[PDB]
Subunit: 344 residues, 4 copies
Amino acid sequence: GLVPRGSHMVVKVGINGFGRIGRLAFRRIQNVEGVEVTRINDLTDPNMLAHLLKYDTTQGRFDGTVEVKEGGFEVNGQFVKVSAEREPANIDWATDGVEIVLEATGFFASKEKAEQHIHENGAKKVVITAPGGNDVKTVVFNTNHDILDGTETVISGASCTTNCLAPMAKALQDNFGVKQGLMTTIHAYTGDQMILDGPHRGGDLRRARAGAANIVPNSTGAAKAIGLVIPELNGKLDGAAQRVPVPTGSVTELVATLEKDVTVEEVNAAMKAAANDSYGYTEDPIVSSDIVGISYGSLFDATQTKVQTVDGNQLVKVVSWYDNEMSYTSQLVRTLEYFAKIAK
Amino acid sequence: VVKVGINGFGRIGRLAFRRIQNVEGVEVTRINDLTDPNMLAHLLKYDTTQGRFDGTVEVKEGGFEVNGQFVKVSAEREPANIDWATDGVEIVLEATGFFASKEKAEQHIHENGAKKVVITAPGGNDVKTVVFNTNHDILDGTETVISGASCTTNCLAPMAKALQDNFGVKQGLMTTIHAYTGDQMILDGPHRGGDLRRARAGAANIVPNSTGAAKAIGLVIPELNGKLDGAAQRVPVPTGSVTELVATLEKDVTVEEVNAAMKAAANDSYGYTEDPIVSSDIVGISYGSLFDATQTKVQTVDGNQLVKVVSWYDNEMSYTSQLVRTLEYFAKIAK
Amino acid sequence: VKVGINGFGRIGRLAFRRIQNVEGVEVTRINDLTDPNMLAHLLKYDTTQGRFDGTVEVKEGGFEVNGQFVKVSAEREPANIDWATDGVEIVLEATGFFASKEKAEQHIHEGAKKVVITAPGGNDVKTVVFNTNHDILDGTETVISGASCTTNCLAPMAKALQDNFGVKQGLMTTIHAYTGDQMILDGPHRGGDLRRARAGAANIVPNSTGAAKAIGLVIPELNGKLDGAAQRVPVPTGSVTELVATLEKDVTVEEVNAAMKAAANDSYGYTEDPIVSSDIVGISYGSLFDATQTKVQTVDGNQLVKVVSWYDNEMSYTSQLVRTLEYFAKIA
Amino acid sequence: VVKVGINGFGRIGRLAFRRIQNVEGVEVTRINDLTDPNMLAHLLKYDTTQGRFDGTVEVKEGGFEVNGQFVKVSAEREPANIDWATDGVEIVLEATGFFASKEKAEQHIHENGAKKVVITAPGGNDVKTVVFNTNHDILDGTETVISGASCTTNCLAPMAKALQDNFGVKQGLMTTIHAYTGDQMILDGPHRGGDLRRARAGAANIVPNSTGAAKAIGLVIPELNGKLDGAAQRVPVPTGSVTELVATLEKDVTVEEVNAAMKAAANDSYGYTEDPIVSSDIVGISYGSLFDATQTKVQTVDGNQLVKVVSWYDNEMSYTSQLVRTLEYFAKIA
Ligand SMILES: NC(=O)c1ccc[n+]([C@@H]2O[C@H](COP(=O)([O-])OP(=O)(O)OC[C@H]3O[C@@H](n4cnc5c(N)ncnc54)[C@H](O)[C@@H]3O)[C@@H](O)[C@H]2O)c1
Ligand SMILES: NC(=O)c1ccc[n+]([C@@H]2O[C@H](COP(=O)([O-])OP(=O)(O)OC[C@H]3O[C@@H](n4cnc5c(N)ncnc54)[C@H](O)[C@@H]3O)[C@@H](O)[C@H]2O)c1
Ligand SMILES: NC(=O)c1ccc[n+]([C@@H]2O[C@H](COP(=O)([O-])OP(=O)(O)OC[C@H]3O[C@@H](n4cnc5c(N)ncnc54)[C@H](O)[C@@H]3O)[C@@H](O)[C@H]2O)c1
Ligand SMILES: NC(=O)c1ccc[n+]([C@@H]2O[C@H](COP(=O)([O-])OP(=O)(O)OC[C@H]3O[C@@H](n4cnc5c(N)ncnc54)[C@H](O)[C@@H]3O)[C@@H](O)[C@H]2O)c1
């Protein structure tokens, strides 16, 4: 009884932080009827933003036309406004008809700080493109978007790694039950790393290092905070990251103990059965470049599955790919579209 | 002074050579590869990842001089055709990657050939496989062919042994996040070994790949035979690797106990650090394995424990350091 | 017209991909040194050029592409390849090992009627940069060259310069992607090159190129006027060609850019956007002039002119190769 | 016994510090940056491109100890607020990239501040710009603010000077194939300086970019003023660069004459090699410029000659070596 809108009823969106996720989100929204970006806010002039939309190192040239104008740029004819406002509270989203804001700066990933968008002459609601702590409903599309009723003011699209891990973990539990698990994600370097060795503004002595010239260990909360997405796994998973020199493209390895004894084929079959728009399945021996730009939020790879049986005991290894950029963004926009229809 | 020959003056061959400069009683008098001395001299002088050669290298007829001393160079495809004896070589380093087998390595041993061979890679199950300071006990000096194991084995072994000796290991799964190597293609292309993943551009991809190091650990630590398995993710750094092990133990542990056990096991071969380092920081190190306490994890869910232990290794110099330790010791006991 | 590919490598596989969208040209046979499973996989998946747009399924002695079977053989010697059995008239010689009239002719026997070499062939072979000198083809030739990657980039740019202002002399530098003839890590180079021996994805690597010297084969009125060299750098594909020249006419920056813009077509593109190498990966221009890098230096009376054009050493070259192949197939 | 302070403990700051360990009579007693000592100590110990620090480093309150000796660390955004004098600092290395101007560098000089400043980058005009062993003649020791020039200038200068002194230079165009640097974005993103090319992922692109080193060579070799221009192609190596110069000369030359002239000009600052090396081979070298004879070209078409000369430089250590030579000499002449 959620009374969703048709794709003909156009919900106007604003993007805060026209960065990697911001710009790719924008690109995907071009092919989503009933969702339209009318305003972008960042920290720079429209010329910079127009150029970065047209040309993209890892995701290819923009499919369309982009022409710069005063206070914005035109995309296939349609003007989009550009503002350069550091404070979310100072952004007059309402003037451009924006109901929902994509918070994609990385600096306001908190209920308190995201709410700052909602005010007189501002936006109605906000989707954070990152974990927003617990306090905020955290959604991995096609895993737990049940949880949305449309009354929420602030929601999170979770992290890149969470959207990869969730379907894979859920499938495991639903079929065999998960006792505990440790995760490693071999991850592309990202914009929060230094291009060369230098002082890291967040105090991280590893993200301080040249990201495109090192294997760089780093912490991730995605495994710990999986309880926010699959409640019956709360406190059962932990993990970490190894950041490596590819500009996008990642993979998540999970090592787990299960309640049921399993064989490799049963695991792969279970994953194949769980496949959908969000969770893909493959038996081809692919590498990271092969998953750049894919629209699955997670792509299980059967060729890497391991089931080790020593004495009575079993360790199970399951691996899924994800383009930390497009995989996440695809999920984000699915979630945004659904949230826009259901919005109160 | 025991005179050594190198077959395959490649990454491991050239670094082995470099280390032998600072090992008294071991001397390389002959190199065999598939090319002229000029190529080999240049590749010794200049090294992308391991820096300029510390010394002088001048090309000559049929070889080159290193700090004055001439080293002979031959270009012989067949090991059986290499007259090692003429240059006084008793032990050969087999480092080509093409003769990693007892049958094929023995081919070096003949009339005017070598007495013994050390393979710079896993050889068969019928060859003694040595990780220095872990199981070099196993050598008596009568062996004709030995293996220095793989890069990953020398990293994993001390870490695993320490775990067992202190807490006992039920089972374990390993992932090594590994530098790309010369058996990968620089760009997408047909892989001569039939591997559809090593066929891909190695410096532009995360590339999954199999490794037997975890399975064949029994050859080094017999009491772990059949308890470990694992795999690799090859990534774009030209050298430098790290080994992650996830294990169940017989004893319940804490993070601090694990780190302490590792620290206690530290020596020339197994290093210990609490600094939050990255791969470039371990390029050129002489430890075969370097435990990193900052990455240790002990997860306790209900009664049950999963333990995670991580050690760095320069797949190049770490392995090579161990190889030369093993070579030195094997040379001095060669009865 | 039925075509065969010898060497299903970077250029071979991309040529194949482009031929999917060329009506009247069809690849019925591939020869390499490996099993069909390897070749099918490498066609489907491509690090730099993206997933294959279509379906590929392996079978006995070949694979099916969107239903249609393509035969695969693994024959080391060109003379032993029975091209005729699969209806092949023209062979793309793309192995890098038979870039010579003598060695390319080895395909013609029964076998194939004609051959296009995907690289500089001898001085006794017609060397074609499409939309620059494909005039030179009459269709009677048995062996032709599609030139090098850097030649197809340089030619339109140089021709435009001469046709408008006249070229006295010029020096070229191409900042070039690393290629399959470099070592992934420091190691013995089979061709004896001490620089291609070095890890290609971790070094700026100087290297020689004959494209500037042998431009006479494409633009005769520039013969002996140009020389140059390469700096190979760590990107897996994508390159750029810088030319520094003295001209007969005094020029301004705007006149040069305008001349280039006027010369623009399917082969020679023009842009004023400040792009980088990734932006030209997969483009179909053989050369893409970049006005933002143009320089005209006037010291005393004298002028040095700098002109720069991008090219995807992979797809740019391949696009030109297939244009040339299509046109050559139409004639006989 | 001259005490130095470093402003901006970055790539050049930290390598300068490292080299000063092996310079008697020069000692760093204070570092100012924008972060805690723990970050700076770690970045000194461990260095992706230049290797582990040769010595011992232990963090302390308000600083760290290097081989026993304490060095103070402050985190002061404004140069005018840095009390350099309290730690005995006479000369400051301005290495932040934000104060490369006489006006802005002078802000270091005040009551309880420093006496003099060396900018690790091109400063204005009316700042003396020094490439060691090329034009350090120009220093008398009375100057308050000096520039150590750019990375590319220290590479180009000895090469160009040698050319003019032997054959005379009419004009020239330069291309430097350059390592990516900290002013590029790690991934495509808004560039604070408005550069649409430095906005792009620096380790995944060939990135064209402008450089003034060729234009402003007149500040170092006056008799070349207005004769040279050039540009850069930034490429994916984390350090290590090479400078190509194409020139017309007053004299007709052969390849061998050019190489010989360069060899004759060789010294501590300008090196000479005939080995076919690549960029990694010059990482960490102490030459400010390293001529490579294997890349020399002399093209003669009709009567006319175009001459090509190429020299390597580690934009990091090559520059830094020159900077410290210049700093040492400037400290002794104050
Ligand atoms: N792989 C990924 O990139 C990835 C995946 C999933 C989630 N995320 C998350 O998405 C967010 C952004 O990631 P990214 O890689 O796109 O970052 P990015 O750095 O590429 O882009 C962030 C943008 O925010 C802008 N910005 C910063 N402060 C601002 C302010 N006060 N007002 C307006 N604009 C501001 C910057 O100019 C920049 O363009 C982060 O929260 C990140 O954790 C990233
Ligand atoms: N990371 C590492 O490099 C590493 C670590 C541990 C063990 N290993 C092992 O060491 C061996 C070599 O590894 P690499 O990385 O140095 O390889 P590499 O490609 O760098 O070296 C191979 C060398 O062998 C030469 N060669 C090939 N066939 C020959 C023949 N018939 N006769 C003489 N020489 C021949 C080649 O010319 C080349 O110089 C392999 O067995 C490998 O598995 C490598
Ligand atoms: N890739 C480029 O940048 C580029 C640009 C312009 C021209 N070219 C030219 O194209 C040719 C191929 O280059 P590439 O980059 O595709 O190299 P590549 O290494 O990708 O392709 C070579 C292919 O030929 C096969 N091969 C080798 N020997 C063979 C034989 N005897 N018989 C049959 N097949 C054999 C190999 O298995 C491989 O698949 C070269 O002549 C090169 O000069 C390449
Ligand atoms: N790296 C090179 O290739 C190179 C070569 C020659 C010259 N330079 C010059 O050296 C200077 C620094 O370059 P870099 O490569 O070391 O950059 P970098 O980013 O590594 O160093 C800059 C450092 O200065 C600090 N900083 C910034 N603002 C500050 C302030 N207000 N007060 C104190 N500290 C501050 C930063 O925290 C950082 O640690 C630039 O002018 C650059 O042009 C660099």
